[PDB]
Structure 1
């Protein structure tokens, strides 16, 4: 109640308005998503919480495509995530029509990024409050990026977020360190499943449904695909192995 909590038509004494700070805090009590960068691709995984037997398995999906080769998953407030993506699409299509090429990940990042920054310089236009793990492959490699509430983004090589962040990040850095970057795309699927399974240990008063995807240069042939069938059964096997089972 200072006008640094009711308006963003000013600069704050903390260099940010309170409501943007609050967006960052609400990502963390949320749902877990990770992103694994590897030497030929990226892998995405997200924990989908099960609260009832009334939900249907994989007919609600959280990982949504932009283009055909960039995969987007996000954690945090559901409505804000729809709106971010809808925008993400309009940029992506405009790029494909106008330059006659699929869009680069550092390019795509600058376009969403500038739009998250816009909604954070007006006194009555809502901030975003999702952290988006996104990425894909283009004509000079694979890239993993993570976008925050505040409009903050950098390239990542491993990324983690959510309730189970602490655990997740621990396993994830160990494995990334051990590996040249993450080893094969294939190996990374199983690994990814272990992190999500391990993070689920931080919330056993609910169930999960493991959901993975990938986007890999020679291991999806440039496309983003959902991870399913055998490839999903195998990652499950590996996961229940280490975390006892």
Structure 2
């Protein structure tokens, strides 16, 4: 009863199949997004289940367009398919209007899409929360997208097992800078609170990945963090938690 499809509805006003899908991402990886003034900084915890893996080869950060970063948590194949559709959307906009799609526009379109699969018993919903953002001529934007098809403006967002650990620190970070803060400094921050959300993942070990889209350094394109900047961040977070 009311737990056999996504087009039953309960007298409670609740859809449980859809609610249940948020729990899928709750057993996913920890991922954070800091909304900056110049851009956005994403970071994602990559769990290490053995040492046979090859670190920074197993991508969860896919770029959509030349300027929208997307990183997702939850059931992995599902999230890769959600990004798959969104790349088609990027090309279509470019084809008709000859300009890269805006950040709010992309957010809109994905919401429609995730809506569609909770309206029919003939397609299965997704099991991912995605975090994406960027820079356009309306400014920097940050969005988190539920598998219900919900998004909002976000000063800071997180998801995964340690979404609680992450969000608690982001509140204090708006206390430190009530004027928002720079993307370049937020790289070091981004590492910091994944280490803090690895205290819920403290019977495992992790690989840290960081990606950024900022207008003040990378000219408003979405790129990866690597090399010297990366290891500075790794060192910072270590000493703090030690």
Q: TM-score, normalised by structure 2?
A: 0.96
Residue-pair matches, total? 242
1:38–1:181 contact (8 Å) kept in structure 2: no
Preserved CA contact (<8 Å) 2:73 2:130: yes
Distance 1:68 1:181 in 2: 28
User: Which range is displaced more, 42-51 or 166-175?
Assistant: 166-175
- Alpha-carbon shift at residue 181 of structure 1 (Å): 4.7
Tell me the CA shift for residue 218 of structure 1.
Answer: 1.9
CA drift at 1:27: 1.4
Greater shift, 178-187 or 211-220, is seen at: 178-187
CA contact (8 A) 1:141 1:217 kept: no
After TM superposition, give the deviation of residue 240 of structure 1 in Å.
1.1
Tell me the distance in 2 between the aligned counterparts of 1:172 and 1:235: 17
Of stretches 235-244 and 64-73 in structure 1, the one that deviates more from structure 2 is 235-244
- In 2 relative to 1, CA 193–182 (structure 1 residues): closer, same or farther, beyond 3 Å? farther
User: Following TM superposition, by how much is the alpha carbon of 1:78 offset from its aligned partner in structure 2, in angstroms?
Assistant: 1.0
Secondary structure, counterpart of 1:107 in structure 2:
helix
Matched, 1:65 2:70: no
Q: CA separation of 1:224/1:141 partners in 2, compared to 1, >3 Å: closer, same or farther?
A: same
Alignment of 1:66-81 (within 5 A): 66-81=64-79
CA-atom RMSD, angstroms? 1.3
Structure 1 segments (4+ residues) deviating >2 Å: 7-17
CA distances 1:9-65 after superposition (whole Å, capped 9, x unpaired): 343323332211111122112210000011101000000000111100111111101
Q: Partners in 1 of 2:129 and 2:88 — Cα distance?
A: 20
Residues 181 and 129 (structure 1), Cα distance of their counterparts in 2 relative to 1, 3 Å cut: farther
Cα separation, 2, equivalents of 1:181 and 1:243: 26
In the aligned structure 1, how far is the partner of 2:38 from the partner of 2:209? 21
The answer as to whether partners of 2:25 and 2:129 remain within 8 angstroms in 1 is: yes
Three-state SS of the structure 1 residue aligned to 2:153 is strand
Tell me the secondary structure at the aligned position of residue 173 of structure 1.
Answer: helix
Q: Is the 8 A contact 2:6 2:121 kept in 1?
A: yes
* Residue number among 222, 225, 228 corresponding to 2:226 in the alignment: 228
**Runs of 5+ consecutive residues of structure 2 not aligned to the other structure:** none
Q: Name the SS for the 1:108 alignment partner.
A: helix
Establish whether residue 90 from structure 1 lines up as the match of residue 88 from structure 2: yes
Q: Between 189-198 and 24-33, report the one with greater CA deviation.
A: 24-33
Is the 8 Å Cα contact of residues 146 and 159 (structure 1) preserved in structure 2?
A: yes
Partner of 1:238: 236
Q: Deviations over 1:132-154 (max 9, x none)?
A: 01011111211000000100111
